[PDB]
Amino acid sequence: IGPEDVLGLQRITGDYLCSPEENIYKIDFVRFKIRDMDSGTVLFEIKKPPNAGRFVRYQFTPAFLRLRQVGATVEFTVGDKPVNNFRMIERHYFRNQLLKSFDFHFGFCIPSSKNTCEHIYDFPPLSEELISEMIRHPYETQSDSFYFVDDRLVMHNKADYSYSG
């Protein structure tokens, strides 16, 4: 799977597009934090010291949906193989309506090391009807996170969201 195989998707995938063992670079996300860039509020943070740890569910408030910009801090370790052109394409849908796709290129990845990246999400302006529907139907908003190293898919994580606070 390459970036061209996901950049036009109009629905959540019916399954994971790669197996865990496709992660030959041993990329392991060890911290993920999201902060509202307009208030400094930390909206979510997690650290670690059958899905297989690839699905996460979020519980945010209805105010999330009116945010302008969110900053995500990612920490990850990397194994001993050099990692070049590490890229995430992450696509968010409500009921299979594409809300936004974010395409992030990680900076340089130091092998055999903990690395950090900051991703800035600029939220799409959502119509009032969408925001009300997404608040009313928790977990029907979902995302696919597709991670590529040298244009090949190495990790695929899934998420779903509630805004029912």
Binding site: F29, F44, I46, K48, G53, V56, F76, N157, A159
Partner: peptide, 7 residues
Amino acid sequence: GAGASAE
């Protein structure tokens, strides 16, 4: 989805 792994 980076939040999945971090748990």
